[PDB]
C-alpha cells in the first residue's frame, strides 16, 4: 500500500495530511516537482502513483513505471488524456480519475462573473479611476430578478449554475440534448432558438462533444439579444473564438467572461511572463477590454481541492486493494 | 394638480412618460436642468415640484415657491436634508420623499461585491495582466456555501441581502437592535460578538443613527476573523475609515467593497476630473488596492429608477389631492 504523489501544490498538502491521518497504514510520500525522465527513479518501490500533470511524461517514464511494477496511475483531475493510455495498458497499469470536484464552485463562478458584467464592475472601475463619480446611464444596471438567464447544458454543473441564478431571482431557461427532470427544479427547458433570442445572460455548461463544438459561432451569436452577456466556464471549444471577438468589437455582445479558451493548452496553468503568446487570437482574447478573462479557475476552491485530493487517494488505494472503483478508466 | 419635474435624467424620462400615461389629465411638465434663482419663474402655476437636485437652491427660490403658492416639494430620493426645510415650513409647503426604491438592487450589489472579493476577481486580473496563469494559493477561493455571512442591520435592505446570500448557499447570521420575524426566513440572529468573530464576510445594512456611527472601528475589527471580507452598501459613517485602512494595510481584513464614504458629500455624484479630492483619507480609500470603491451605485438599477419616479409622482399627487401620504415628512 505504498503511494507516491507528484505535482503537489501548497494548498493540496494539508489535505494529503488529513487523508493520511484518517488512513493509517497507507504510505503516501509526496513531491512538489513533476515526474519526468530525470527523476523517474523516485517511482521505485511504489504501487500507486497520484498525479496532476499536464506536462507530458516521456515514454521512458512509463517504461520505468512498468519496470517498477506500478499498479495504478490516479489523476487528481477529471481529464486524463494528458497521460499515455497506450503505455499504461501495455505495462498492465490501471488508471483512475476524479470525475467531479465541486459543481457549486463552477456555478458560483458563473454567477460571480455574470454579476461583474450585469453590475458593470469594470466600467464603474474605469470611471472611478478618472474620479468620475456620476450616476450615469452607461453604468445603470438591470437586476437579475428582472432578467432571463439561459443555461446551455444541464448536467451537474449546469444545474448548480441554474440553482444559483434562480436563487438570486432570475428566470432561468435551459437547453440540453437530453433534458432531465432534476434540472426542472431550477429552470424551464426551451428550444435553442428561444434560449438564444430571449436571454439577457447566457452561461455555457456543456461537455466537449461533437455537438457542443463551436455551438457559439457567428450564426448563433447573431440570434442573441443585442447587448447580451456571455459566460463560459465550460471548455473553450464550445465557442468559435474569432466570432466572439468580432461580436464584442461590433457591440452585439456587451461583455463576456471567459474562464477557458479552445487552444489554451500551451499556456494554462503556467506563468507566461517570459513565454510570449504566439496565438494571436488568444492574445486578443486575454487582453480584450470587454472580456473578463480568467485562467481556468472556476473550479479553484477549497472544496474542489479537498475532493481532488481525497477522491484520488481513495481511488488509488481502492484499486490497490483489488476492489471495484467507479472512478477507474478501463483501458 | 399641476406638477413640474426638475433634474430629469435620461433614464428617468421613460418612467415619467409611463406614469403620465396611467394618470391622464395630470399636468406633469419636465426639465432636465436644475431649479435655481435664474430660472425660478418656471415655477409659476405649479402646485407640485418634483426634484432630485444635487445643488443647493438659493433662498429666493424657496421664497418664490411661496409667492407661487406651491403646495408640495417631492424628492425622488430617501434623503431630503439637501432641501431647505426651514423655508418650506415658513411658506406652508409640504415635503415628501421616497423611502425605498429597490431593496433587491442593494442586496444584489452586496452579493456581487462579496463575490468579487471571495472569488479574488481583482487579484486574478492582476496575475492575468502579467500573463501569470498559474493555479496559485493567493487566488484560491472559499465558496459561499462553505461560509458564514454576517448581516449587520435587518431592515428591508439587510433582509434582501440575507435572502440573496442564503440563495447562493451561505449560512447567514444577523444582528439588529430589534430582530424581526421576516428576516428569520433567511438568517439566524446572533449577538454582535458572535457575528463579528465568526463571519467570513460581513455586510453592513444599518441606518445612520448614533448607535451605528463608527460601529466598525479598531476595536470591532480586532474581533473579526483574520482574513475577513467587508462590504459596505450602507452609509459611510458606519465605518471609522482610518481604522479600516489600517487593518487592510496590516492584512487583518483581506479586502473591502465600499459603496460609500463618511465624508463623500462634496464629491458624490459628480464628475471630479477637474476637482481634486483634498480629503487625504478619501483619496487613499478610492485608490487602495484592497478596496473595491464604487460611487454610491448599489441602488442604481432600472427598477430603482422606476420606483423613484413612480413613488415621487404618486406622493406628490396624493398630497395635492388632499389625501394622507405615508411618505410625507411633517415639518
Ligand atoms: Cl432592474
Ligand atoms: Cl470552499
Author numbering:
A (entry chain A), B (entry chain B): 1 to 331
Task: Copy text verbatim from the article accompanying this structure deposition.
Herein we have characterized the structural, biophysical, and biochemical properties of the first enzyme (d-lactate dehydrogenase [d-LDH]; TP0037) predicted in this pathway. The crystal structure of TP0037 revealed a fold similar to that of other d-acid dehydrogenases; residues in the cofactor-binding and active sites were homologous to those of other known d-LDHs.
The protein yielded crystals that diffracted well, and molecular-replacement phasing followed by standard refinement approaches resulted in a model for the protein at a resolution at 1.38 Å. The difference electron-density maps associated with this structure were carefully scrutinized for evidence of any bound substrates or cofactors, but the only convincing densities were assigned to solutes in the crystallization medium (ethylene glycol and chloride ion). We hence considered the structure to be the unliganded or an “apo” form of the protein. The second, larger domain, termed the NB domain (NB for “nucleotide-binding”) because of its role in binding the nucleotide-based cofactor NAD+ (or NADH), harbored a centrally located seven-strand parallel β-sheet. The NB domain protuberances noted above figured prominently in the intermolecular contacts, reaching across the dimeric interface and interacting with each other. E264, H296, and R235 were the structural homologs of these amino acids in TP0037, and they adopted similar relative positions in the putative active site of the treponemal protein. Hence, the structure of TP0037 revealed that parts of the interdomain cleft closely resembled both the cofactor-binding site and the active site of a known d-lactate dehydrogenase (LbD-LDH).
